[PDB]
Amino acid sequence: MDKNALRKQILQKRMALSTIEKSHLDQKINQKLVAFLTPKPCIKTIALYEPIKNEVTFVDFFFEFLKINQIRAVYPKVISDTEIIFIDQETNTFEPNQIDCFLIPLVGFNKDNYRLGFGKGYYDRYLMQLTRQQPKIGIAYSFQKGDFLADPWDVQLDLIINDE
DSSP states (O other), rough: OOOOHHHHHHHHHHHHOOOOHHHHHHHHHHHHHHHHHHTTOOOOOEEEOOTTTTSSSOOOHHHHHHHHOOEEEEEEOOSSSSEEEOOTTOOOOOOGGGGGGGEESSSSSSOOOOOEOSSSSSHHEEEGGGOOOOOOEEEEOOBBBBBOOOOOTOOOSSSSEOOO
């Protein structure tokens, strides 16, 4: 139940994914993501992330879903060694409670929806500012689920959308 154990097994499997395999996994995950948003009309501004090597990718039809329903996307901008903010494509900043939902990147998650991040703590600190009970949604591959004890500084996440 050690975090190091997981982090190692996951980074291993993520890099090993074949271009054909990743494609299929992301397609199914973005399909599930859209199925999740479709019935949540009050989501008009959503926080995404910039896909780093091996992370689940946001596919072309996902963004199409956003354009069609007029949902604005905001991205994370590291502001310091401990803080991050969200800005849109024009660099307009969006305050925490201007965002209606957060799609969160992760290395691992356990049975209690806890997140195993990249060790910086940005998300944990940022998410403390929410006052509208915005959904905190993890995006990941099924093999990213592991068994570890969560520290109070690990985000709890309402749900982790994955390929299953």
